[PDB]
């Protein structure tokens, strides 16, 4: 028992991490087979960064202007090309530590592990969620670009995120492994800011189910609610409207705990109206929305 914000074992991802330098700019790259992926803005000097034309910057580069390194060891770049906001560099040798993998675009509200890296070297791993406004509340220092987000289904790594930038508020923006940005942000330094964010209702309920499964039950109550009456309240408190699809998803956890979903909603309703009155849930004094229903079920079984 117990319940932790838990990340996927990162070893499979560690053996894919490389460094990519183009001039005075160094960041991380992801090495699978004979190809290296990194943010295309490795080619920009910060100068270019206020209004970069990436077609212009890229056409002016040679394969040999990219310094790719696996630790101390250079990989000869034999090919380059651009994919949305990614750079794909072909190299002359294969990464034998390459795992079974796939590229996936996740939906806001979902979670994944980030392997923060600097200069191609693993630094730390943490579990986090895609905010509803498509930002990540992360811990990225200068040079963390190219670090990836991933999930692991068995022996297969699903890469869903690559890190590109920090926003004015101090959250982080990036792309899937095809280079398409999450959200309405662009790789250039202007005054873009994070849109309004909400709380991930679906996750809060899951987390409450986790607390319950773990002998915490104080927040429960005798009432129930309809979906509509729940949304009419929850939306005053800045929570994502809850849908029937979301209810269904909570199905297995309802069965396990024997607490009916709408009942758990009633519980949440009061928590929002009355705070926690000093009390805590699974250690926390706030409602955590960074666990998906699926996470809860894997950690609690």
């Amino acid at each position: 028992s117990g319940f932790r914000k838990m990340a996927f074992p990162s070893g499979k991802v560690e053996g894919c991490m490389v460094q990519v330098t183009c001039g005075t700019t160094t960041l991380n790259g992801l090495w699978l087979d004979d190809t290296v992926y990194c943010p295309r803005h490795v080619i920009c000097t910060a100068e270019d960064m206020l209004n970069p034309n990436y077609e212009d910057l890229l056409i002016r580069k040679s394969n040999h202007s990219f310094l790719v390194q696996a630790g101390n060891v250079q990989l000869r770049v034999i090919g380059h090309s651009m994919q949305n906001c990614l750079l794909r560099l072909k190299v002359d040798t294969s990464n034998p530590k390459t795992p079974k993998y796939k590229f996936v675009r996740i939906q806001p509200g979902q979670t994944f592990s980030v392997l923060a890296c600097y200069n191609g070297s693993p630094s730390g791993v943490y579990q986090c969620a895609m905010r509803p406004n498509h930002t990540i509340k992360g811990s990225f220092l200068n040079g963390s670009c190219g670090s990836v987000g991933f999930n692991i289904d068995y022996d297969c790594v699903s890469f869903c995120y690559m890190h590109h930038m920090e926003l004015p508020t101090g959250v982080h923006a990036g792309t899937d492994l095809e280079g398409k940005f999450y959200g309405p942000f662009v790789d250039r330094q202007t005054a873009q800011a994070a849109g309004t964010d909400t709380t991930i209702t679906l996750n809060v309920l899951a987390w409450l189910y986790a607390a319950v499964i773990n002998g915490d039950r104080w927040f429960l109550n005798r009432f129930t609610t309809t979906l509509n009456d729940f949304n009419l309240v929850a939306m005053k408190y800045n929570y994502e409207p809850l849908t029937q699809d979301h209810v269904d998803i909570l199905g297995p956890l309802s069965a396990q705990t024997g607490i009916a979903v709408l009942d758990m909603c009633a519980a949440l309703k009061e928590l929002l109206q009355n705070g926690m009155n000093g009390r805590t849930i699974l250690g926390s004094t706030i409602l955590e929305d960074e666990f998906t229903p699926f996470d809860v079920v894997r950690q609690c079984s």
């Binding site: 910060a46 670009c145 590109h164 926003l167 982080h172 790789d187 250039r188 330094q189 202007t190």
Partner: peptide, 4 residues
């Protein structure tokens, strides 16, 4: 926006 600071491209990190």
């Amino acid at each position: 926006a600071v491209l990190x």
